[PDB]
Amino acid sequence: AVKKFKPYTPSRRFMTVADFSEITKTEPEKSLVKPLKKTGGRNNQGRITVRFRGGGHKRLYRIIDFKRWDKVGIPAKVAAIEYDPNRSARIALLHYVDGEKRYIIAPDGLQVGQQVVAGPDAPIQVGNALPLRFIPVGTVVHAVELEPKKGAKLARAAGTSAQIQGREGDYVILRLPSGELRKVHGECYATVGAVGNADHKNIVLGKAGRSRWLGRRPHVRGAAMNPVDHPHGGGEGRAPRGRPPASPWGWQTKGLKTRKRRKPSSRFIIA
Amino acid sequence: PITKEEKQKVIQEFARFPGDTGSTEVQVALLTLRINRLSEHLKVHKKDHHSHRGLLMMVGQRRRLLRYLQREDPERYRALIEKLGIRG
RNA sequence: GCCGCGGUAAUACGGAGGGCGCGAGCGUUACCCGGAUUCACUGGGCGUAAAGGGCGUGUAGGCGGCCUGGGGCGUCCCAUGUG
RNA sequence: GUGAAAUGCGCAGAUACCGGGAGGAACGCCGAUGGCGAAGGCAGCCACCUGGUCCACCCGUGACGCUGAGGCGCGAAAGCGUGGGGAGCAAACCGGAUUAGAUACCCGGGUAGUCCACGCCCUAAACGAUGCGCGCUAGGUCUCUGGGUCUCCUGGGGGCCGAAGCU
RNA sequence: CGAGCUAGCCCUGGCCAGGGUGAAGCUGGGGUGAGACCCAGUGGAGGCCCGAACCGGUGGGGGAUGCAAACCCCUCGGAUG
RNA sequence: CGCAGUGAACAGGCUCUGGCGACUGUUUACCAAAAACACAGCUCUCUGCGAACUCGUAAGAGGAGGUAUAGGGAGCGACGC
RNA sequence: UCCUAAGGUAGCGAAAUUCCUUGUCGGGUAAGUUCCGACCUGCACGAAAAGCGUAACGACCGGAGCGCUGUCUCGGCGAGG
């Protein structure tokens, strides 16, 4: 729904926040499965290797289930929709009949009290997970494995989906959130429906702190540095790159394709 | 829709003397029922402007009448309105 | 004054002869009413001449079928004061 | 492809034909001088919600009516905001033609836009260029839709010709 | 050999006198066919305002073998991010 | 009752009109605080996941326990037109 | 008519951009190489190294008033180190 604020301050004029209808009636996360402390840390063995990352609210990690084929045939009730700091989509805590609990990346439509289940048997309805073969060609579907038994890799950003496009032997044609068209193995599970919290794209951050709260440090333009510092760097008063735009590292950044030519991922992709 | 029964029950429930099918008091309670039922509908289908017209036509009728009713009789004017829930 | 007059034969300009009107006046300009039923009550209209509101819903207001009495504000008549 | 052309596409394998798939828009025939709607306007099929209307039965209320300054709502297309979609078509824009010139008319492309949602905008040859309600004043002709002890009679609607009258 | 200065990030702690302004939401009334909305009352939001601590370092004067290898004075910026 | 009542001390001078930058912020420690950088937001571009990209001879790790509404690079820098 | 790959649109314009320049007209003042409003022959603006505007913000740079003053006419006296 996206709350918009009255301008009792500049900046709070452009800022908009999420509705939280979404999740209601459950905030403190599930002490049990949920938490491992999450490790803030914006680089590897010494050196920063992602620029401009750091700061931002101390944050606990919710351990979700991206491999639902453990619990084939066991249904579970959807117990609550709760807030996840660690991703754009919201999550649903569901108690399996099994006793056992886990978090699924909460698909659109899903509502407290629903029962949900995974297997080749499963009804073709919201939140249920299934091999791609036993899912009807045309349905949209998210949290898709890419190789069988490897965990859900596709379609987990808030409001994403993929669509079953066709069959083809052990394999099955898939239109991805990008627009790419990719064969994925029939045994690769996927959960019917799309992702939801799909207003997520429309938050207007609103000011430059906040950007900080989410741990995004300020990003200094190329020209804006000096030549030691960057390709664009230099120039007496203000400058026009001076051919052709480039990362700090030098490699071209307007139009240059980067994916590896002879990748065996090829032959599976088609867009 | 509004069934035969739901209709009748309202009518026999607001009559002046069993058999009375017209009458100010009843005519009203007919619309009221239609209205709320309609009221309820437009609340979902906001974009249905055509059907909204009719509502405004009834709304008048109801008014039209109530003003007659009130003019002749303050007594069973309260009765109706209160035992029916209107005046906004 | 309005329509218009004068480009070599002008009853329209200028003079002249004659003629019409009014007369100690006669003309002009200004302004009011009139003609103007051209803000229309008396007394105009809106298909194409200028004029129907793009269409509904309804507030104030305007207007109101048949019949019987009560009042008599509008309405009519009489006298009288004033005018 | 045109008036004839040229731009353009095509031996890097087009056009023409076949099979398999993707996607969006608009619904042929029925279809009419037809119907519905206060207007704008509404057209493949299905289901649900919902408005107005017509006929018959003379059962009920008992003048509860008509109109409506202002207010309030709706209001084609174009256009605007946020986001989705984008096959076809297409302002702008570019190419080829024509021409004295051609910022056009014709041809090859082509971006918004056209579509969805949500919110604005409020105009129009928004035209019957004819405000609403009622009563009254020859008929003829064909048509849609209802009701009748259905060669016909009656009610509601859509056209044509015309008494009186008006112009 | 150095990050016991300085720059960034990570882990865990601590700090921000007191004033002012008064968003949303509630409640109530008014409103309508329902609404939208408008009214009080409550409420307590913000890289909100004044201003100590704290952080700073704008302008001027002083210092200039200095109190000082960047200091002193008046003035000034931020002060729940 | 005084010339005088925030009687001492702490304690804003105001107005009109241009240029630049939307904004609070950051900087040349020690001559520059700005019209510089940053910034919410706009566009282009790469990346289908053993992602692209970065550090590393490698193993490895960041990216991210994220997955196109997400991540890298680049430019403009609220908003209006 | 010659040349080009094509010849600057909107909007701005003596500007942080104008050399000639103190351009020229207007405003402001007793007097204005600055300022403000205009006019363009724009030496050498112009659309995302954005174009033209913009409420509010500013220890940012320009131009006027009013208040007040030892800044000054022009200096004098006094206190302390």
Swiss-Prot record, chain A:
Q: Name the InterPro entries for this protein.
A: NA-bd_OB-fold, Rib_uL2_dom2, Ribosomal_uL2, Ribosomal_uL2_bac/org-type, Ribosomal_uL2_C, Ribosomal_uL2_CS, Ribosomal_uL2_dom3, Ribosomal_uL2_RNA-bd_dom
Q: Name one Pfam family in it.
A: Ribosomal_L2_C
The signal peptide annotation in the UniProt record is none
Keyword rRNA-binding applies: yes
Q: Where is the composition biased (Basic residues)?
A: 256-271
- State any GO CC term: large ribosomal subunit
Keywords in UniProt for this one? Ribonucleoprotein, Ribosomal protein, RNA-binding, rRNA-binding
**Ranges where the record places region Disordered:** 222-271
Q: Which Gene3D superfamilies did the record assign?
A: 2.30.30.30, Nucleic acid-binding proteins, Ribosomal protein L2, domain 3
Q: Which GO terms describe its molecular function?
A: rRNA binding; structural constituent of ribosome; transferase activity
Biased composition of type Basic and acidic residues is found at: 229-239
List all membrane-crossing ranges.
none
Q: Domain of life here? A: Bacteria
Q: Which GO terms describe its biological process?
A: cytoplasmic translation
The family database entries (PANTHER family) matched by this protein are listed as: LARGE RIBOSOMAL SUBUNIT PROTEIN UL2M, RIBOSOMAL PROTEIN L2
| Subunit and interaction comment | Part of the 50S ribosomal subunit. Forms a bridge to the 30S subunit in the 70S ribosome, contacting the 16S rRNA. May also make transient contacts with protein S6 during translation in the 70S ribosome.
Q: Which family does it belong to?
A: Belongs to the universal ribosomal protein uL2 family.
HAMAP family reported for this sequence: Ribosomal_uL2_B (MF_01320_B)
Describe the task this protein carries out. Answer: One of the primary rRNA binding proteins. Required for association of the 30S and 50S subunits to form the 70S ribosome, for tRNA binding and peptide bond formation. It has been suggested to have peptidyltransferase activity; this is somewhat controversial. Makes several contacts with the 16S rRNA (forming bridge B7b) in the 70S ribosome.
Could you identify this protein by its name? Large ribosomal subunit protein uL2
User: In which organism is this protein found?
Assistant: Thermus thermophilus (strain ATCC 27634 / DSM 579 / HB8)
Swiss-Prot record, chain B:
List the GO molecular function terms: rRNA binding; structural constituent of ribosome
One GO biological process term is: translation
Which Gene Ontology cellular-component terms appear in the entry?
cytosolic small ribosomal subunit
State the UniProt keywords alphabetically. Ribonucleoprotein, Ribosomal protein, RNA-binding, rRNA-binding
Tell me the SUPFAM superfamilies matching this sequence: S15/NS1 RNA-binding domain
Q: Which domain of life is it from?
A: Bacteria
Q: Name one Pfam family in it.
A: Ribosomal_S15
Q: Which Gene3D superfamilies match?
A: 6.10.250.3130, S15/NS1, RNA-binding
Q: Which PANTHER family match?
A: RIBOSOMAL PROTEIN S15, BACTERIAL AND ORGANELLAR (PTHR23321), SMALL RIBOSOMAL SUBUNIT PROTEIN US15M (PTHR23321:SF26)
Q: Which family is it part of? A: Belongs to the universal ribosomal protein uS15 family.
Oligomeric state and interaction partners are given as: Part of the 30S ribosomal subunit. Forms a bridge to the 50S subunit in the 70S ribosome, contacting the 23S rRNA.
Q: What is this protein called?
A: Small ribosomal subunit protein uS15
Per UniProt, what is the name of the gene that codes for the protein in this document?
Answer: rpsO
